[PDB]
RNA sequence: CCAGCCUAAACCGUCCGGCUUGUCCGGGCGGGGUCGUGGGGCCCUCGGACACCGAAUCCCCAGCCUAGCCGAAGCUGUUGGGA
């Protein structure tokens, strides 16, 4: 099973990552310990918006301090 | 004997709660949609309301069921316990 994991995990990967486990690992450890969540299409999508909306949250807090470079220099 | 229909999904509005507040995610209601000459969603351009079609639902009636009622035309002998 593939999960997205909410915490950097040794052999696995870092947070936010989507990785393939053996279900046993997922259903009996990852999932239970809340260290990861099911790669549901219902959640790969809930990652589209976590992804884009902290990317444009700085794909604009840079487009903003760019004027402080237009006239404060 | 005769007859065909409703939906799920995209898509839109909504209300609720979950939260890492996100143009999201999930659940509920509504709309939308229902097909194989493929169909629907969405986006463009066009004539449709007064078009007509129409129930398997509902309303009234007829008819029927559960009691009934009307209904024609004969009398005398005669054997016989009795016609
Ligand atoms: Mg196995
Ligand atoms: Mg969705
Ligand atoms: Mg979506
Ligand atoms: Mg419906
Ligand atoms: Mg949807
Ligand atoms: Mg919606
Ligand atoms: Mg309102
Ligand atoms: Mg409908
Ligand atoms: Mg009108
Ligand atoms: Mg009719």
DSSP single-letter state for residue A13: B
Q: Which residues neighbour A12 within 8 Å (Cβ) at sequence distance 6 or greater?
A: A5, A19, A21
- Judged by phi (left if over 0) then psi (alpha if -120 to 50, else beta), residue A21 lies in beta
In this complex, the nucleotide whose C1' atom is nearest to the CA atom of residue A54 is B22
Resolution value in angstroms: 3.4
* Spatial separation of the C-alpha atoms in residues A46 and A13, rounded to whole Å: 19
- Determined by X-ray
Q: Is the CB of A45 under 7 A from strand B?
A: yes
């Amino acid at each position: 099973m593939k999960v997205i994991l909410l915490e950097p995990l040794e052999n696995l990967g870092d947070v936010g990552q989507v990785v393939d486990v053996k279900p046993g690992y997922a259903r009996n450890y990852l999932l239970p310990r809340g260290l990861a969540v099911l790669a549901t299409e219902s959640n790969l999508k809930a990652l589209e918006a976590r992804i884009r909306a902290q990317a444009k949250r700085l794909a604009e807090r840079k487009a903003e301090a760019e004027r402080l470079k237009e006239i404060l220099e």
